[PDB]
């Protein structure tokens, strides 16, 4: 999740929480509010892809 797109050769680490709707989400999660860094699942129970 991000408010806007990235510019070339840029990197930005900010573990804020991402709001979409009509709720102030400052530090506390809730409705229309998400946490960006959701991880990968890598298993040898899979195929290529």
């Amino acid at each position: 999740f991000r408010k806007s797109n990235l510019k070339p050769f840029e990197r930005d680490i900010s573990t804020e929480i991402y709001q979409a709707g009509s709720t102030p989400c400052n530090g506390v999660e809730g409705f229309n509010c998400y946490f960006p860094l959701q991880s990968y699942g890598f298993q040898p129970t899979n195929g290529v892809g």
């Binding site: 979409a20 709707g21 009509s22 229309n32």
Partner: protein
């Protein structure tokens, strides 16, 4: 449900629903694309399944 203009105001941000998320479609700006037809199924499921 055909021949509509679909105002997703009350479904997205005025919502009272246990979830709102769509597979393969970003459910935040779903207004600015459209499709041939969309349907509505309704069944009666208890809050665990």
């Amino acid at each position: 449900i055909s021949n509509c203009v679909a105002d997703y105001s009350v479904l997205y941000n005025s919502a009272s629903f246990s979830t709102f998320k769509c597979y393969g479609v970003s459910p935040t700006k779903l207004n600015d694309l459209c499709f041939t037809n969309v349907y509505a199924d309704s069944f009666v499921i208890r809050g665990d399944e």
